Amino acid sequence: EPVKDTNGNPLKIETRYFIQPASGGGLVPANVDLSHLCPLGIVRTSLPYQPGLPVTISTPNDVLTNTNIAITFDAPIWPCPSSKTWTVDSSSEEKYIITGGDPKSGESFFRIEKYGNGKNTYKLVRYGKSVGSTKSLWGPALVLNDAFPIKFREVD
Amino acid sequence: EEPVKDTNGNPLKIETRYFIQPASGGGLVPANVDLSHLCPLGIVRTSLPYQPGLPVTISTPNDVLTNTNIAITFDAPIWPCPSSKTWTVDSSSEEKYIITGGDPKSGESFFRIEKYGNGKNTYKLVGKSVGSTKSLWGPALVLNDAFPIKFREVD
Amino acid sequence: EPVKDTNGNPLKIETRYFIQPASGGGLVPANVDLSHLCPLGIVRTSLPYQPGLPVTISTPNDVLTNTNIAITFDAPIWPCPSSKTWTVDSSSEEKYIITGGDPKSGESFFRIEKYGNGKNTYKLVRYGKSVGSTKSLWGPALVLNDNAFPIKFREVD
């Protein structure tokens, strides 16, 4: 079934959305620790009115639940030599969700699933392993569990 | 001596949060002016399109009126500099950067909101107006010898 | 008695020294945590051949043990609106040794004392409260104890 935004409208591919915590402000690029600059991790900003860095969703025009999708940050500047596409830091113990994935490759595929109670609330799951958060340098950072509830706000 | 209006045409209120958005990239934010100064912070225009800016509250020494002494203070849950979030002029610098750390009750921190050019709800900060200069992180607010702004209410 | 450098020579005021851990490289400015940029703390660099940021010692020309001295970083550029003089962050729980002190004021007075093993090895003590270290953002940061952080003074050639 269709993934809905905060206005209850269906999510469209190639459309800009803030991924906002459903449970501070939105989700943003920040480095995971002082040992890694690139690629970047995804942290919840502690600043109350910051909407997040927008993302576009792509499918290998509706975004449906339980289907393979790829999340890519939308930014006019990017200081890392790799992509803005979310992926899993396989090497790390923490299993941080990091940038630099290939949006056409399976290493970058997540699934948007419904999350408990409230409407328009979702979780990211990787194939069942869900995306959660861990305390890190800049605040809560997205990690692959062995769930971090999110909403999608349309960028007006 | 008429009311300053926000982007919705509503009058500005003191002790209310507003994004100061360029009228002319996203809103106005704290960033350091160059690699020689960390504190206090300057005010730069973010190059990221949907960043609203760091909110400010306006205070008067409840309406904010044009051509009256006001003080602009950043609203932030964290502040890593040992001084205030109140805008003021970096007197020492050649560039005359608008910097944080002013005293909101003191005259060193008084600006006046004046009408700018054509469009409604467009203003400037002032007979020396606030403009911008190229700096480290992008356009930084400076005192001229005008940088047009709108006030968006933080909903 | 005179404080000696790593060459066994007496320390002189207004002379540049690296304060090197006696126990990684020398002592350097870094911020203590992500909530404070200025003033700066003093951390031990984890990079093996970095000598530290040099300091000059001042007295309110010989530097003697158990006498009031003030430590001031020597740097051509300084991005904080305060001094390069070491002092104690009174407000913090950790009691970080921070920059921004007044070198003529008592808030900035430390005493160089002999430390245990080996010649030319010293500790900083504040009036007895000694200077130790704590884990912080960038690595071990100098703090005032209630574990003394042993130091040598290397002359800057």
Add this chain to the structure above:
Amino acid sequence: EPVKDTNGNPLKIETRYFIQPASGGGLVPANVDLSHLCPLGIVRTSLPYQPGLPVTISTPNDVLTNTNIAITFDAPIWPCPSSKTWTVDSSSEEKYIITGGDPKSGESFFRIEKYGNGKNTYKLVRYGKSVGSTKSLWGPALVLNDDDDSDENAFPIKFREVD
């Protein structure tokens, strides 16, 4: 002929050296501008007594002049997903010397040549295009000159052994 260090001793491969400006302190990693974090550029530190970040030299045990060598930073921490080996940023207009090269590949080969009068003073040349410097974010950054291999805009260097 052998490249000599600041003590006049011949340079050895797999040995740590500070590359110090012959002409501020030594050469260090810093980003080139606010648009690039990785890979890193090479800047001259403006802090007088900072020796530089040490490098080891490798040859595809003596380091000789006018022979292909590769310069690799020696560092306990490295936050970029690529190597510590110097190479040329081909894409950039400035032609910054950047990290992330392959030390066994030709993209990373420099040649150490004599510079001017004074002994133990050298330049880096790429095959004749010499390494110079340009004003950048953190200070003078190493760049590849266009040059007919002269010492005019070449960035003169000494090698200090890390004791």
